[PDB]
């Protein structure tokens, strides 16, 4: 599913991401834009041989099982394929664990390099939330 901007903003809010670990909804929408372009089916191979899955490009090195990431963990206890669903419940549940792990949203290098410190409110502009 390719979410619309406000569509994804509504879904993330409904799933309790708005101000989760102090991150406003626009931070999460911004992260999703630069990680996946709001595409639930996005997959990207990392140089270390792990893969990033779904709207928030959750990494098989630590968070989900894809059966092809040696010495990896599955801390969200989910198949990485579950992170490609049109229903973002699994991605959001797993992202709550990631953002809680100590470095907040710096876990998402695209967030740190493209969203952090910017006018992230712009990403929920015009949305009926
Ligand atoms: Na894994």
From Swiss-Prot:
It comes from the Eukaryota. Disulfide bonds join 6-127, 30-115, 64-80, 76-94. It is an enzyme of class 3 (hydrolase). The active site is at residues 35, 52. One of its GO terms (molecular function) is lysozyme activity. One of its GO terms (cellular component) is extracellular space. Residues 1-129 form the C-type lysozyme domain. Monomer. Lysozymes have primarily a bacteriolytic function; those in tissues and body fluids are associated with the monocyte-macrophage system and enhance the activity of immunoagents. Has bacteriolytic activity against M.luteus. Belongs to the glycosyl hydrolase 22 family. Lysozyme C is capable of both hydrolysis and transglycosylation; it also shows a slight esterase activity. It acts rapidly on both peptide-substituted and unsubstituted peptidoglycan, and slowly on chitin oligosaccharides. This is Lysozyme C. It comes from Gallus gallus. The gene is LYZ.
